[PDB]
Write a protein that binds this ligand. Sequence first.
Ligand code: U2P
Ligand code: U2P
Ligand code: MG
Ligand code: MG
Ligand code: MG
Ligand code: MG
Lengths: 194, 194
Amino acid sequence: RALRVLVNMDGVLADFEGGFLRKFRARFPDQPFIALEDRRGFWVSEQYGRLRPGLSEKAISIWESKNFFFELEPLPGAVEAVKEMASLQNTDVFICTSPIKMFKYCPYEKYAWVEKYFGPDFLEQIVLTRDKTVVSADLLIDDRPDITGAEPTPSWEHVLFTACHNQHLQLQPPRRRLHSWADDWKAILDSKRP
Amino acid sequence: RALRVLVNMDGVLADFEGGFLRKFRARFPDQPFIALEDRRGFWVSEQYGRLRPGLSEKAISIWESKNFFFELEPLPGAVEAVKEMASLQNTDVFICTSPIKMFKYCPYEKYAWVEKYFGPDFLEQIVLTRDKTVVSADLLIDDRPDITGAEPTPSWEHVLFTACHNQHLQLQPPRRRLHSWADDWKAILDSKRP
Ligand SMILES: O=c1ccn([C@@H]2O[C@H](CO)[C@@H](O)[C@H]2OP(=O)(O)O)c(=O)[nH]1
Ligand SMILES: O=c1ccn([C@@H]2O[C@H](CO)[C@@H](O)[C@H]2OP(=O)(O)O)c(=O)[nH]1
Ligand SMILES: [Mg+2]
Ligand SMILES: [Mg+2]
Ligand SMILES: [Mg+2]
Ligand SMILES: [Mg+2]
């Protein structure tokens, strides 16, 4: 009866792409980098790998570092929108995020970040999973174009959240975007209600 | 098409009740304790709270401590059964566990424990959530009797895994138990297949 919305963390709430570029440039000032307008394809490390040998591993070392996830800046409007969304009648919001392979810091820091921006009570809304298709909901707002896993027919409609890496992608017509948090997310939610 | 089984961590894979009692008795040797045969009700801290003032907070301090989750012993047969289960044709296994409120160690250590007992590739199967009803599957094997949340009609059948705290409970007849990992878990899975 309550509409259930899964909101992705990196690329939707937290500015992974911007945080990564800043920290990559500071740590590796003599390496070439990819400006955000030139990002293509979901995986940062894949595009850096194509740019030169060794750069995939150096990119990965940025997000494996302590405080990388914790120090990510919220995307404009994201905290405000999710706070409002969760406060809506008949609306349950979960934050659905996948941890990286190296798990020393990342899970912890994601909990710490949600506490910092949404408060202790919002920690109850976090779902950490590598497979988003096994989480059931009406909507999934997520910047990754292709979201697959063990469930061939997910219950959610995936709404693509615009990010530098996907902004040029033509989607298969049924598929829909949320262009930013300034865009009309309430209309998207309402289209799914009874 | 693949049968999806959610296997709970504490009380099913990891011996939380035994680990807790041992560490509580070592840290607080002059306090009364609850032998496992006398445990009743899911929440350890609630029963300790009834035993005397201040004991809820002392119990909580055990599982909030560094290395509590990591050092939990697997329950008999649990690692072997889950390894076999995941290897079965047309069978996907996820480990579904809720973190405690204090998140400094617990998420991290749960990933570390799964790596230790199941290997790096099994980390892909972990689902960390406070609300298990929003995870879709055919089965949930979990020692907690009452599992509720945002989804009023979960897709899974909850099979109650026997634990000291629930072993005397009469269930509402449709409901089923897995009595231990030595019990016939394959028959339970097969009853759900096409
Ligand atoms: O190039 C990358 C690499 C990683 N990630 C975030 O980390 C999760 C695990 O790879 C990815 O699933 C994603 O986290 P999420 O969007 O689920 O919070 C990126 O965002 N971009
Ligand atoms: O008395 C207690 C207190 C906590 N827990 C485990 O920690 C999660 C959060 O409370 C509880 O959900 C449970 O973890 P899970 O079974 O999901 O791995 C217990 O097991 N017993
Ligand atoms: Mg993302
Ligand atoms: Mg609400
Ligand atoms: Mg349990
Ligand atoms: Mg299998």
